[PDB]
From a paper:
Receptor usage determines host tropism and transmission of coronaviruses.
Indeed, RBM insertion 1 accounts for two-thirds of the difference in buried surface area between the two structures. However, the restrictive effect of this glycan is less pronounced on MOW15–22/[name] S1 binding to P.nat [name], underscoring possible differences in interactions with different ACE2s. However, a recent study reported that PnNL2180B (PN-βCoV) primarily exhibits intestinal tropism in its natural bat host, suggesting a potential fecal-oral route used by these viruses in bats.
Residue numbers in the entry:
A (entry chain A): 20 to 726
B (entry chain B): 389 to 404, 410 to 436, 441 to 589
Write the structure that this text describes.
Amino acid sequence: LTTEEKAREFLDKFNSEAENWSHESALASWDYNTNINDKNAQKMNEADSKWSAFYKEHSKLAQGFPLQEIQNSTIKLQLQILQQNGSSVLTAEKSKRLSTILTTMSTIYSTGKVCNPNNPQQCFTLSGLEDIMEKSKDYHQRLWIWEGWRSEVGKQLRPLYEEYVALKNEMARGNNYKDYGDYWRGDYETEGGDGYNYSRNHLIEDVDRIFLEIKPLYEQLHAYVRAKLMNAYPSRISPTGCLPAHLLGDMWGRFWTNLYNLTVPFEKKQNIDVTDTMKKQSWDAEKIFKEAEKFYLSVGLHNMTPEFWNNSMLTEPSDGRQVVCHPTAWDLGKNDFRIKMCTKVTMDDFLTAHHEMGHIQYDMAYAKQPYLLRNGANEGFHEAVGEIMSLSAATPKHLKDLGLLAQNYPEDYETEINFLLKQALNIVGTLPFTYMLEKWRWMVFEGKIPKEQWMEKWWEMKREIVGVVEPLPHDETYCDPASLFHVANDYSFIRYFTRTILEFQFQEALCQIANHTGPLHKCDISNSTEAGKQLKNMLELGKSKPWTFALEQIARTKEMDAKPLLNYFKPLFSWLKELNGNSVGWSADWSPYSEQSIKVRISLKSALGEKAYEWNDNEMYLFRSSVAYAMRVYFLKVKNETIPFRAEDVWVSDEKIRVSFKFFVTSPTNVSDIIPRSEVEDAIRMSRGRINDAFRLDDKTLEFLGI
Amino acid sequence: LFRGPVPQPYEFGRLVYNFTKLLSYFQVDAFECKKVTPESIATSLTVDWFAYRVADKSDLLPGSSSDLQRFNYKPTYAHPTCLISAYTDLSALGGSNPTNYTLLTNCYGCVGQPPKRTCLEEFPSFVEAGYRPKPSCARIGMQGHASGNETYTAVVTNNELDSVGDPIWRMGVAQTKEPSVTDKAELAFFVS
Ligand SMILES: *[C@@H]1O[C@H](CO)[C@@H](O[C@@H]2O[C@H](CO)[C@@H](O[C@@H]3O[C@H](CO)[C@@H](O)[C@H](O)[C@@H]3O)[C@H](O)[C@H]2NC(C)=O)[C@H](O)[C@H]1NC(C)=O
Ligand SMILES: *[C@@H]1O[C@H](CO)[C@@H](O[C@@H]2O[C@H](CO)[C@@H](O[C@@H]3O[C@H](CO)[C@@H](O)[C@H](O)[C@@H]3O)[C@H](O)[C@H]2NC(C)=O)[C@H](O)[C@H]1NC(C)=O
Ligand SMILES: *[C@@H]1O[C@H](CO[C@@H]2O[C@@H](C)[C@@H](O)[C@@H](O)[C@@H]2O)[C@@H](O[C@@H]2O[C@H](CO)[C@@H](O)[C@H](O)[C@H]2NC(C)=O)[C@H](O)[C@H]1NC(C)=O
Ligand SMILES: *[C@@H]1O[C@H](CO[C@@H]2O[C@@H](C)[C@@H](O)[C@@H](O)[C@@H]2O)[C@@H](O[C@@H]2O[C@H](CO)[C@@H](O)[C@H](O)[C@H]2NC(C)=O)[C@H](O)[C@H]1NC(C)=O
Ligand SMILES: *[C@@H]1O[C@H](CO)[C@@H](O[C@@H]2O[C@H](CO)[C@@H](O)[C@H](O)[C@H]2NC(C)=O)[C@H](O)[C@H]1NC(C)=O
Ligand SMILES: *[C@@H]1O[C@H](CO)[C@@H](O[C@@H]2O[C@H](CO)[C@@H](O)[C@H](O)[C@H]2NC(C)=O)[C@H](O)[C@H]1NC(C)=O
Ligand SMILES: *[C@@H]1O[C@H](CO)[C@@H](O[C@@H]2O[C@H](CO)[C@@H](O)[C@H](O)[C@H]2NC(C)=O)[C@H](O)[C@H]1NC(C)=O
Ligand SMILES: *[C@@H]1O[C@H](CO)[C@@H](O)[C@H](O)[C@H]1NC(C)=O
Ligand SMILES: *[C@@H]1O[C@H](CO)[C@@H](O)[C@H](O)[C@H]1NC(C)=O
Ligand SMILES: *[C@@H]1O[C@H](CO)[C@@H](O)[C@H](O)[C@H]1NC(C)=O
Ligand SMILES: *[C@@H]1O[C@H](CO)[C@@H](O)[C@H](O)[C@H]1NC(C)=O
Ligand SMILES: [Zn+2]
């Protein structure tokens, strides 16, 4: 036999056994998740151990089949999957150390607390802090939570992230990658003839191209939100500047969904909600899933198996069992499909049921593929397929046909604007976030951004790309990106960017086939078997073909295209454009603390000559201490107040290599309270003589601009 | 069918026999049927009709993407139907001939009330098959016809209120065209 023939036999045997072992693991995991106890946890761990031992043995064996001698692309692809080394390229000490670091970062994140600075006995966990950030409209409360999280947790992760980056890059190099960023970008890499090849470097060019196409829409949404927040927080937001990071609706500014109550276009009109009708008509969990099944059948896709309806958990157990309700779709192997969900009779769970069943439909479609190829074409394909099914099901058109919405229910254009705006806050307002975050991490792994400039570049990029400005200047003891779940837990993020773009390409292509006329957001592909067939042809491919091929099969293109997204939100764009006028855009010069900051310029050479010293970190510390002193003296003598100002209450920003920087002072017990510039300038003059002596400087070599 | 002014596409007439006898008043330029043959028509009866141009008969046909069937009038073909496009001098029959022909070329919704009313071309108002155009779209065609303007653009409301009691505004465009046949009324009929 030849190498290819031997590889053929190897894979056939592997795939057969892999299915058997994978099934046993899946069953044990299921039993645990639907019945949480110690006995099931033990069975789960044992089943996973057996799977891992199996996979590793065959991974090593796969190394005996050189890819250079394989001409069959199906075989070559499966071998490439098995032959990956990963962490095993590291020595035992480095492999163990990396594992330890990853565990540590995860633990710090999940157990972090922030304590109210004016109430030491009131401490919240991340879940509590998130709950507050999603609802609070209090400028001060939001600020100490935002800053607290970054200081309490971010400063613990900083040193771990630095070691993490070094270790992950060494691993990537051991696997013949340039760096860990290059490693991650390999998830979009494909090879083949025609234009079906996609290099890792091309991913960077495509996300930059797409971002620029989206940007004009984001700027209109940004300007609109800014105008509304200026009313919610008077005198806090500048009409031509960036938005304060802590006022964006959540802990990180990832979604703008929670701003809807402040930004809603037409407040006298409500969105469609059929929850009350579902209850009135006596709907239950079973009926909801049965209706989802009918939807998929109307377009020529499968029914759920007899087993599905028996094995699945569609409602929360009433028998005492503890479960995790978070909705998931399962493929256990051997034609065993299940959904685990705690369904309520609501519109939200109605749409969720369609989403989860969409995942099952995809899993069934490629069940005929070899075990290793039973996946989506890319990491974003499964989610894109699920989302388009939810969009269709949620239309007024569909709801009327179901009897959940009055047949004579009138159309209202203001309601449609409210709908599109709410969608934009979740879909559009997040794209610059995902783009900016990955761009930063890629540059950090590559080495374009040195450790000394990690936070400097983070916030520079935030202002230029997203249009968000920090409430307070942060130095390099901070690690703001690590305060996010996905960064701390070593997950890739770009998948969210690509998922969104694909989602709209699929929706538009299917609506054209279904001969939909009018606005895209009102499209419903129900009863279209032509649209169904076009989709099925893509779904059944699994990952046996290049994703560019899979995309062409549905959207008739080999490239990602932002136009479908821009078309979806076209009516919103036009409305916003007319309303915003020429107020669209932002500068990156303004910040919440810039108006009352004082610029200091020092010349040590002209002061001391040969006796001149270096303005190092220790000199900066002394300066801040000297300012705090001046502030204590001023307040005690002028206001008759005793205020314990410390060096830590003196904030320093915009520091250059030359001795030039700006500073401002806050109250010891209040971070939203910035001491007026006039009070600070008065304090400096009063103690100017002592500040001078401290550094051996005169009034020409130590200049306070404005004095 | 031969009395008064001839109805326009946006205000078509609706009225609910010797088929040959009727087809002796008009000179037929084109004729077509769907789900039926004219022999069967001769061997309820509903007649829908409006002023149109014979020069533009291609737009009356099934599969057309013209403005007529988007904003003015569209058949359902649920029942056996025949299309007739023909012309005659109606004055001698007790009616009157039109001096020009008017149709809606666009109509779309508007959000908000004055002075903050914003009209969006992205929210088109299409006529449903078997139905008349909205009162606010029909208003535009009427004013356009009588304006003496080849292209007439307006924003109107016509006793249409929303869920909170506010006026519903619509914007659209009407187009007026000259007759193609000298001293004759050009008509389109949909008979089902
Ligand atoms: C997909 O296509 C099917 C088949 O045409 C649609 O089902 C149909 O739904 C309509 C109402 O939406 C049914 O007509 C009406 O049914 C009610 C009873 O619920 C009755 O009281 C009315 O007098 C009238 O007959 C129609 O009979 C029914 N056709 C069937 C079941 O064969 C379905 O609604 C379409 N779904 C979508 C999203 O378009
Ligand atoms: C198409 O034919 C119609 C007739 O069916 C023409 O309508 C006529 O248009 C003139 C303006 O060109 C109207 O005269 C104006 O009436 C108003 C209101 O009384 C008055 O304020 C003006 O000073 C002027 O006299 C005329 O009344 C109107 N006829 C009818 C019956 O309303 C229409 O102009 C023709 N369209 C085109 C493009 O030729
Ligand atoms: C993957 O790494 C192996 C070497 O690592 C050993 O085998 C792994 C499967 C794992 O068990 C490690 O802990 C082991 O230390 C590579 O095999 C070597 O390849 C070179 C050519 O570059 C060859 O000269 C050596 O003789 C090979 N050594 C052995 C034992 O086969 C393998 O090529 C790597 N595969 C990839 C895709 O990088
Ligand atoms: C989707 O529509 C096409 C084309 O229909 C025409 O153009 C449309 C935009 C619209 O204006 C229609 O009213 C027009 O009639 C359909 O393609 C036709 O299919 C029939 C078979 O049923 C065939 O005899 C025709 O020759 C086709 N016409 C062309 C130009 O190819 C298509 O079938 C429609 N899709 C569905 C699911 O109905
Ligand atoms: C946005 O406004 C809605 C009300 O329109 C808020 O929803 C209400 O929240 C309270 C408190 O939890 C509930 O008691 C009400 O029953 C809810 N009403 C509805 C219709 O859901 C919503 O919480 C607000 N969101 C934010 C971020 O403020
Ligand atoms: C698919 O492979 C071809 C090579 O056959 C790539 O084409 C090269 O692209 C680079 C970068 O633009 C150019 O500098 C080369 O000159 C091109 N070579 C040829 C022969 O055209 C192509 O870019 C790859 N496609 C993708 C998406 O990566
Ligand atoms: C910290 O300082 C801020 C000022 O930045 C205080 O803010 C005030 O809050 C009250 C509400 O109780 C408002 O009436 C004032 O107008 C706010 N001042 C300003 C300038 O906006 C805040 O109360 C302080 N927090 C404390 C002392 O806990
Ligand atoms: C690749 O091998 C599979 C069997 O594993 C076979 O079905 C397929 O036709 C082969 N394709 C080519 C191009 O040889
Ligand atoms: C859906 O289920 C019904 C009832 O068992 C069955 O008759 C029908 O053929 C199924 N649909 C498809 C496409 O097989
Ligand atoms: C559902 O699964 C249980 C457990 O295997 C089995 O005993 C029961 O008979 C099944 N019911 C149906 C309808 O298949
Ligand atoms: C009337 O016609 C003129 C052109 O002569 C045009 O500019 C004007 O807008 C028209 N009036 C309306 C209401 O459209
Ligand atoms: Zn999902």
